[PDB]
Ligand binder design. Structure first.
Ligand SMILES: Cc1cc2c(cc1C)N(C[C@H](O)[C@H](O)[C@H](O)COP(=O)(O)OP(=O)(O)OC[C@H]1O[C@@H](n3cnc4c(N)ncnc43)[C@H](O)[C@@H]1O)c1[nH]c(=O)[nH]c(=O)c1N2
Ligand SMILES: Cc1cc2c(cc1C)N(C[C@H](O)[C@H](O)[C@H](O)COP(=O)(O)OP(=O)(O)OC[C@H]1O[C@@H](n3cnc4c(N)ncnc43)[C@H](O)[C@@H]1O)c1[nH]c(=O)[nH]c(=O)c1N2
Lengths: 539, 537, 53, 53
């Protein structure tokens, strides 16, 4: 028998990030994993800005960057018949087009990077243990029972062969795409990788229309006597040929992610195809949504109803990414159609298409233009979906509305990020300075606590926040941004992005979402802080 | 539970043993009492032998990405305090151009500064990935040995349960108060407050007797921590975590008892001068693992394991005595300033004014101070010979009849390459498809390798016979023009000390076990007898 | 270079030049595509020569 | 320093100036005999002596 506050079943990105955050917040956790090691395979490698912002908040962004390939080396996607064959063209993937890159820089202090899951996992798992989480591998969750005060789970130890029980206040189901935890909580659902080595002496990612195969990276992956590798390369005048692995995926999202004291996250609540690099990133963001809420509830600073916001905020995103990843698959077949090929052409059919594509006729021109259109429409799955990645819009009892209408989106909300300071949107990034060194708005906030941002004519917020803090027993850090202060609006970018007057305030949750906005520091405005915070905390 | 090897401890020694044993196809269970890898500032100087090991197993590039390269380690400063007067500087970690050349010539690898805080998780994750079972919050309580194996009792600090593990061997990698070594009855001979802090202010030695300062975040070596003031030393700038290390200087005279092998701090406990501890501990593991693997696979006799004590015990004594002796180089600095070992602020102020005296007496003091500062270098990068000049004598090294050539220059300060059996294979650059590759990169990977040139082609057939007969892999590399590996710079011919048709047999740990002068019939016939002798067969 | 340094042109010279790290690989061959006889460390590129430099 | 180049041709057993003669020299330089090892060593020695220039 063991006892903990939270039992975390699974030590992939979702579980390991939950353990790390809970341990940083002073909460006792036990994280288990069935297997001997972290994940070995080529799996994820695209890390998006929201994940990198989370790592930045907890102090792991610089270690992530030292293991990763920066964004400048991710842009060249090549569409071809094979590596040696004819190139159809290229596309600027991962926001490498100058305009896309500007939109990227404006959105976040962080950037895309290429960091194999193979490295990402042990980095976060070692951090969880260092910060205080108990971590135990070769240990399998078999089931649990729940009562009025907690949960009791049965675990099988694969080193000793012993079974034992663990008693917890809450269980996190971070146990992947066939989650037993989710099955036991009764959650409702709706909806070949080949490593090899070779010297390819004679861009960053190749899409081969052979229907579609992918090739990247001495060591290579494409997606046992594997002369699929020939064909893709495609010659046989060069010669390894394994390890080989498979992923069966059945597209489904949990409609609800919570049942009593059980919270599921990650692939356990969203299972989808890998198009867009959304899985690991969304899974880490699920953890970041939940952990601070658990910590407040366990410390008695919030009522248990604060936990209802997890489902209300993260379930819509589960459905969104599943549908989006699926839709992005449909953008590849039109490439074959533009060449006047069927989805699985013969060698003779392909050969004819290549000659036809170079024809000096009007028919040839029509095909070249159609091919370019089709290739351009794949970018939604390969870096174009910046809006999908960033445009979270939360509606829950952990976001206190300010009475303003939803302004919607000026441009397409899938392709383009739109900054907003309305409650329910992520705090916008802009550069300020601290001692003449650039610092992001995001660097003022987070660290497991609420933060209130204002300017010099909003000095009354400091005292108002101290009262609410004292009264509710919760930390509220106040930052008064302006000339001569600790943090300075050196570029004028804060006044430009805040959408409110200098004396207004933004209350920012530990996960960086705006929970309350006030237009000014009038007595009526100031009195609302205490009512918003009580409402957010269910008190 | 049952495993081939139980590894008690997951520091550098244990984690490296687990990684190597897993890479060799051996089942192991590595345990650690605590929840995490080591949190503290502890080791940070990684030497070339350790970096070579990481290179052999494919972790050198990951280590380098986490580390600070050698170009940022050289500036050691001797002073009264950070804001006070500087006595002078010394080129530490082989940063002087001549020391740097000697360093480059010795190895494909380089010093780097890599905190143990990052080193440990990198190796522990690799061990699990490659097949080791790894289990933290698990404590070794004791064991009993019989003629077929060992049975250990473990306490699980998650479940509170005790259970037993059955193994063929136990590795005691359990640190400076090793319970394993105490239970194996090993005989021993031979006779710091670290303060982290943050402040807005490469290495400072403060003669205040001596304090060190390095690195927003700083370490020097809880409101009484205005020791930090004094060292900085002002208080016009605005104090934990604090930690202690007791070390009692001791080395194990023997490192093995029956089926128990101890390694690392468990067999060599010493002061931190010279950055020898972690490095020596990783090298103990690299000596043992391939031997254990051959024995467990039935390709070597159990007597191969006797060479672990014969090769590694002399190193244990050597580093303990060396680290201690380097401490004695600091007090002469106070003596050159004509100060007592703990001077007052007034006495030191007077020493500083005398040190600038425009007389012949002042010039004598300036020269004496320089001489004393220069003699500290043996503990701060000067001991390249100590780091690299391993000379093994054992049944796992087959002598070639030649006398020991000794050392032309001082064997502590200077590395001397040798290809005589019992010395480390020398590094030189060859090419493979016009890309530079080290001699070391031809060898290792858990197996024996035989190196020769084009007139030594007969070695290929001889090695095949021995390999087939003994059931062991022997990779043969024929170095020359038109071959897979080419002597593009001529450096192999220059370093090998034998004719082109001679051969060097290199062990999995990169030590030379056999050398042949030529490929005559008498020379070729010796291979099989050397390999049998090395394997105890 | 010492002369250029004395008169204040060394940094301009360096901005126009290729540094010493890119001068060492001298290759002896029958032709560029043919067989290579071997290489030599030119312009003090051997580590000992570089130290002396 | 000019006089250090001709010993390279001599180590290959070539005269100072045909394509056939050179082709033979490259095959002999890979010869597995003790004579081939002598030629490889002589060639290296000759190449090394050009470093003065
Ligand atoms: C080919 C490919 C390529 C990509 C991606 C997937 C695939 C298949 N993804 C998605 C990503 O790999 C996936 O979404 C994450 O691994 C999900 O992380 P989780 O922590 O939810 O599950 P994960 O599956 O990673 O972890 C589940 C954990 O639970 C453990 N477990 C299961 N049952 C257990 C039990 N009963 N008891 C104890 N432990 C148990 C498992 O052992 C494992 O540790 C991605 N994403 C992205 O953002 N960018 C990208 O580029 C890609 N690319
Ligand atoms: C301040 C300072 C600074 C330096 C150094 C030391 C110190 C104190 N060193 C030396 C270096 O840190 C030391 O030599 C190594 O950590 C030794 O590694 P081990 O694996 O042998 O022991 P280590 O002590 O690292 O690990 C022992 C393991 O066993 C575990 N354990 C103990 N008893 C157990 C039991 N009964 N059951 C289960 N687990 C148990 C412990 O929890 C731990 O995992 C160094 N070296 C260097 O090369 N360069 C440098 O710069 C420095 N600097």
């Amino acid at each position: 028998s063991a006892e903990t506050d939270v039992l975390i079943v699974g030590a992939g990105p979702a579980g390991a990030m939950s353990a790390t955050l809970l341990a940083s917040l002073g909460i006792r956790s036990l994280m288990i994993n069935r297997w001997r090691s972290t994940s070995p395979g080529p799996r994820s490698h695209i890390i998006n800005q929201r994940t990198m912002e989370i790592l930045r908040d907890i102090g792991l962004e610089e270690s992530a960057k030292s293991l990763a390939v920066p964004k400048e080396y991710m842009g060249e996607h090549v569409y071809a018949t094979s590596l040696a064959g004819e190139e159809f063209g290229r596309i600027p993937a991962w926001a490498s087009h100058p305009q896309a890159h500007a939109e990227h820089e404006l959105a976040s202090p962080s950037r895309y990077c290429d960091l194999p899951q193979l490295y990402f996992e042990p980095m976060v798992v070692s951090e969880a243990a260092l910060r205080g989480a108990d971590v135990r591998f070769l240990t399998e969750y078999l089931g649990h029972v729940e009562d009025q005060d907690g949960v009791t789970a049965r675990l099988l130890d694969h080193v000793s062969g012993a079974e034992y029980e663990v008693r917890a206040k809450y269980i996190i189901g971070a146990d992947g795409a066939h989650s037993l935890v989710a099955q036991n909580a009764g959650l409702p659902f709706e909806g070949i990788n080949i490593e090899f080595s070779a010297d390819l002496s004679s861009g960053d990612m190749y899409w081969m229309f052979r229907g579609v195969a992918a090739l990247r990276m001495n060591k290579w992956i494409c997606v046992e006597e594997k002369k699929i590798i020939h064909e893709i390369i495609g010659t046989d005048e060069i010669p390894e040929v394994g390890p080989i692995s498979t992923w069966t995926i059945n597209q489904q999202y949990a409609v609800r992610n919570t049942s009593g004291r059980v919270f599921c996250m990650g692939d356990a609540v969203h299972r989808h195809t890998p198009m867009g690099g959304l899985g690991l990133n969304t899974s880490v963001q699920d953890a970041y949504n939940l952990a601070w809420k658990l910590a407040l509830v366990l410390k008695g600073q919030a009522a248990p109803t604060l936990l209802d916001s997890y489902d209300a905020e993260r379930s819509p995103v589960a459905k969104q990414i599943v549908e989006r990843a699926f839709k992005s698959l449909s953008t590849f077949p039109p490439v074959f159609e533009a060449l006047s090929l069927p989805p699985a052409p013969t060698e003779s059919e392909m050969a004819e298409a290549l000659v036809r594509l170079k024809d000096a006729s009007e028919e040839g021109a029509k095909r070249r233009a159609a091919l370019r259109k089709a290739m351009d429409a794949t970018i939604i799955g390969l870096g174009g979906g910046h809006g999908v990645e960033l445009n979270q819009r939360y509606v829950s009892r952990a976001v206190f509305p300010d009475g303003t209408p939803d302004p919607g989106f000026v441009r397409d909300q899938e392709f383009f990020y739109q900054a907003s300071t309305r409650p329910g949107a992520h705090l916008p990034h802009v550069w300020l300075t601290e001692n003449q060194r650039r610092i992001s708005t995001l660097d003022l906030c987070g660290k497991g606590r609420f933060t209130l941002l204002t300017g010099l004519s909003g000095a009354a917020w400091k005292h108002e926040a101290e009262q609410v803090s004292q009264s509710l027993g919760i930390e509220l850090k106040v930052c008064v941004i302006g000339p001569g202060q600790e943090f300075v609006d050196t570029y004028g970018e804060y006044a430009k992005i805040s959408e409110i007057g200098e004396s207004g305030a933004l209350l920012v949750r530990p996960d960086m979402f705006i929970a309350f906005r006030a237009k000014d520091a009038s007595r009526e405005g100031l009195e609302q802080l205490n009512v918003a915070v009580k409402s957010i905390l269910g008190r």
